From Swiss-Prot, chain A:
Component of the small ribosomal subunit (SSU). Mature yeast ribosomes consist of a small (40S) and a large (60S) subunit. The 40S small subunit contains 1 molecule of ribosomal RNA (18S rRNA) and 33 different proteins (encoded by 57 genes). The large 60S subunit contains 3 rRNA molecules (25S, 5.8S and 5S rRNA) and 46 different proteins (encoded by 81 genes). Interacts with snoRNA U3. uS11 interacts with MPP10. Component of the ribosomal small subunit (SSU) processome composed of at least 40 protein subunits and snoRNA U3. There is a cross-link at residues 116, 131, 149 (Glycyl lysine isopeptide (Lys-Gly) (interchain with G-Cter in ubiquitin)). The lineage of its organism: Eukaryota, Fungi, Dikarya, Ascomycota, Saccharomycotina. One of its GO terms (biological process) is translation. It comes from Saccharomyces cerevisiae (strain ATCC 204508 / S288c). One of its GO terms (molecular function) is structural constituent of ribosome. The chain holds residues 1 to 171 of 236 of the full protein. This is Small ribosomal subunit protein eS6A. Component of the ribosome, a large ribonucleoprotein complex responsible for the synthesis of proteins in the cell. The small ribosomal subunit (SSU) binds messenger RNAs (mRNAs) and translates the encoded message by selecting cognate aminoacyl-transfer RNA (tRNA) molecules. The large subunit (LSU) contains the ribosomal catalytic site termed the peptidyl transferase center (PTC), which catalyzes the formation of peptide bonds, thereby polymerizing the amino acids delivered by tRNAs into a polypeptide chain.
Curated annotation (Swiss-Prot), chain B:
This is Large ribosomal subunit protein eL24A. Residues 66-126 are annotated as: Disordered. Its main location: cytoplasm. Belongs to the eukaryotic ribosomal protein eL24 family. The chain holds residues 1 to 126 of 155 of the full protein. Present with 247000 molecules/cell in log phase SD medium. There are 2 genes for eL24 in yeast. Residues 89-126 have a biased composition (Basic and acidic residues). It comes from Saccharomyces cerevisiae (strain ATCC 204508 / S288c).
RNA sequence: UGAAACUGCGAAUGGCUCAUUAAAUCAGUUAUCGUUUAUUUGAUAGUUCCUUUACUACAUGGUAUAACUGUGGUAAUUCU
RNA sequence: GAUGAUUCAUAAUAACUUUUCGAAUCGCAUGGCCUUGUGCUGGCGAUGGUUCAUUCAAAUUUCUGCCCUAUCAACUUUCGAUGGUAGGAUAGUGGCCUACCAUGGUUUCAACGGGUAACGGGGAAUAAGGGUUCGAUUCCGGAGAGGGAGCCUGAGAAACG
RNA sequence: UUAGUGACGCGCAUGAAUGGAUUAACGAGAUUCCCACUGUCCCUAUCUACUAUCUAGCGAAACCACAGCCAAGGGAACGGGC
RNA sequence: UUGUGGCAGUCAAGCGUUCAUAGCGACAUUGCUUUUUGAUUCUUCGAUGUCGGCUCUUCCUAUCAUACCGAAGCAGAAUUCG
RNA sequence: UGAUGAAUGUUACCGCAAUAGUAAUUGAACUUAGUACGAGAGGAACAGUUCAUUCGGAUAAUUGGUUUUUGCGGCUGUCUGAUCAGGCAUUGCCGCGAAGCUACCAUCCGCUGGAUUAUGGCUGAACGCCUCUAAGUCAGAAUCCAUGCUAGAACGCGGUGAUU
RNA sequence: AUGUACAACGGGGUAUUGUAAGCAGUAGAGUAGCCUUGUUGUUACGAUCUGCUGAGAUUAAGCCUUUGUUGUCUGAUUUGU
């Protein structure tokens, strides 16, 4: 199948195409949120332990947490719940979704690294990505730097420099 | 070959063993024995039948396979380079917490400038 | 200045048709001392520190989350 | 104090409440007092909030009135029909619903039932006068979104772009 | 559908107390059809009891010219005998 | 016994666009059969259980089909005679 | 129809095979082929493959039926003082129900070789030619006879063992 | 006719049915009674429910198996080339 994996410490993420039914039978008969060792599926992932966060079956239907039932169903979905974006206030809709349990019916798994092995990955571990923004709240900054109730957040601001042309500015 | 699960009792159904009933909702049921089939046709409920997998489940019998999920207690432990931060300079700014006297001197210079600006505004009004 | 997205409002107005419906609608005429009412308009909270003598930030408290970055699923949907 | 009239308005005591509301909001102006501190005060607005009233309404509702049919004369009441008591529900009255009880209610002044090629009115046509026929349709009020039932959101829908 | 039912009617040979026609109800009457039901059937299988069976005891009858393998022949034209 | 019934032949006037005989076959005629009905009265009237159906076996062939073949007015297909 | 059995020196085992009987059956579909043939319309066949019909012989792994397994449980009435456990209800009733029996209601299987008929032919006379025929001869049918299948002559037999 | 002998029992396996009795329970429609008046108050009744309990019973009479226990294993008749 395919594995969309994420190393959240770096903040990076990468896809991996996979074969070997008898390596992915480890993932078979599992739920979302459980943990799984990595060398069981690939020696490249030796010492790695992964958590599952989601998946998308063939025909496009996602999964949902602790629903049950490795097959598909239809469910009524509303606000403050995944898999449904309401286009009208109070709206609800009966959508098809796939269960939480893992099986061969998936084209994709969504994996996240909770602990690193010993060999490092070129796409996740070596590289790192930035936090594309910084705080905007005063106390958020004050605890970001752990300063005080007095330490001039206006001095501890972060500014981004853009180069529209020859002229640049720190925003 | 596949192996199957009695729709009533929950039992592995090996080939050439049991039956298969197709109901006019196009729904398929599988039986390992005329016992469970007769009960299905008598339209009983396995949750009330005491020897079926579903009953043992609903009554939590020998079901210690699953135990519990634990709770996570671990900080982020990654000062991410926010990309307007210059993570080295970000650690420098995080370590430069003391020396608020510079902020105080800047505030005093700003106070002097604000007084001068108020005076200039009053003079221009005059 | 200003796309996108969050938020607030609106989307129940209007427009179309006359199928139902014969004390039902409806007309004119009463009543709410029997009731709800966004919006408007005009008025309108000194009293909330909880053993309320250190229990507290009151120059002012905290957490997410979109948009966005990037990885993808799907044949396809104002899907995710 | 008011009303034609109240257990009205309003106020007061005792407690209750999973505890509501009583501004951690925004723009423009930036001014006065000084024991000159980022000291204390300070304007014109936008937004938001409890309650009352008002306005926009809404829901129920009194009285009088509707075409043709007796080759429809008895209808309603089992399982709500008329009423009473109490309670639930309602935003609120009320058989609106439930429990208990009584046996009532409508009718030749046409009930009930059936039919309508019937949405009702304001009004249109034609007329000496009286009248007859029509009115889906430019305004008002209703109902409906292919047929039925249901429901979230909201002040407001049994919503249908 | 040679059945049944309704109709037609120059009716071998209908017909009026030799009673005619009709008829609610009734009927161990006769008849047809439909619904349900079924081992009547497709198409048969299995179980039970008492029998049959074997044994102990008891113990008959009908019938009997003599008796008891067939084919054909001829023969009173279909014999166990020739 | 075989009129009657059934079955098969001989001949060949004609039908068959022509052409007696592919397939048919008039007038006439030779036969077979006992699954028709008759005729007869031999056997049985001191009793041979009477129609049909159900069931079951076997036989005959004058073969409906199936196997092989021949002929055609048999191009194929289908059909017909043997 | 099936089943015993005297006497053959005894007893036992393995066998032979005279005679008798005999069984397999029919069709469709794909392909051959929209080919051959035919103007066209239409429309084959042999071989091959997968299946099936009628019949037969078995079998009971599976499914189904049967239930005195009176096996487990349940139910009504009555009786044992109640309980527990049971009796009776001409198998009390109900559901499940193994084992056994069993079903084209289930599953499996159902042989090939020769000699021929009709008919078509070879050579070839009779008849100097011609002819399947007269002599000889070839191939040939769901035919017959064997192979195979079932009994095993109880007056049909063999080999072999131990024989007081 | 003294042994991988045979049987009767027992045990185990396999099957069938469907969770035994008994005990306990702050389970239980509700209803009476109590007084220490209750601040679950407790006692009694009460279909049934839950746990011990896929438990218990039956299981070869034509099922499998046995390192167990207890037994049994010389009666009669006839036969000759």
């Amino acid at each position: 199948m395919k594995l969309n994996i994420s190393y959240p410490v770096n903040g990076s993420q990468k896809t991996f195409e996979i074969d070997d039914e008898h390596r992915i039978r480890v993932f078979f008969d599992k739920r979302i949120g459980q943990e799984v060792d990595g060398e069981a599926v690939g020696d490249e992932f030796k010492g790695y332990v992964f958590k599952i966060s989601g998946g998308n079956d063939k025909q496009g239907f996602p999964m949902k947490q602790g629903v049950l039932l490795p097959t598909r169903i239809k469910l009524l979905l509303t606000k403050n719940v995944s898999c449904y974006r309401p286009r009208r206030d109070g709206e609800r809709k009966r959508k098809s979704v796939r269960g939480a349990i893992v099986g061969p019916d998936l084209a994709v798994l969504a994996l996240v690294i909770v602990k690193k092995g010993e060999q490092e990955l070129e796409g996740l571990t070596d590289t790192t990505v930035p936090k594309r923004l910084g705080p905007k709240r005063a106390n958020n900054i004050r605890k970001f730097f752990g300063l005080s109730k007095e330490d001039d957040v206006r001095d501890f601001v972060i500014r981004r420099e853009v180069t529209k042309g020859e002229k640049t500015y720190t925003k | 070959m596949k192996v199957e699960i009695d729709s009533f009792s929950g039992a592995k159904i090996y080939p050439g063993r049991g039956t298969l009933f197709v109901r006019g909702d196009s729904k398929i049921f599988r039986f390992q024995n005329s016992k469970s089939a007769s009960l299905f046709k008598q339209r009983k409920n396995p949750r009330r039948i005491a020897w079926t997998v579903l009953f043992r489940k609903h009554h939590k019998k020998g079901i210690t396979e699953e135990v519990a999920k634990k709770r996570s207690r671990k900080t982020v432990k990654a000062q991410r380079p926010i990309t307007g931060a210059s993570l080295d300079l970000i650690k420098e700014r995080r370590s430069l917490k003391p020396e608020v006297r510079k902020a105080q001197r800047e505030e005093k210079q700003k106070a002097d400038k604000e007084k001068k600006k108020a005076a200039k505004a009053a003079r221009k009004a005059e």
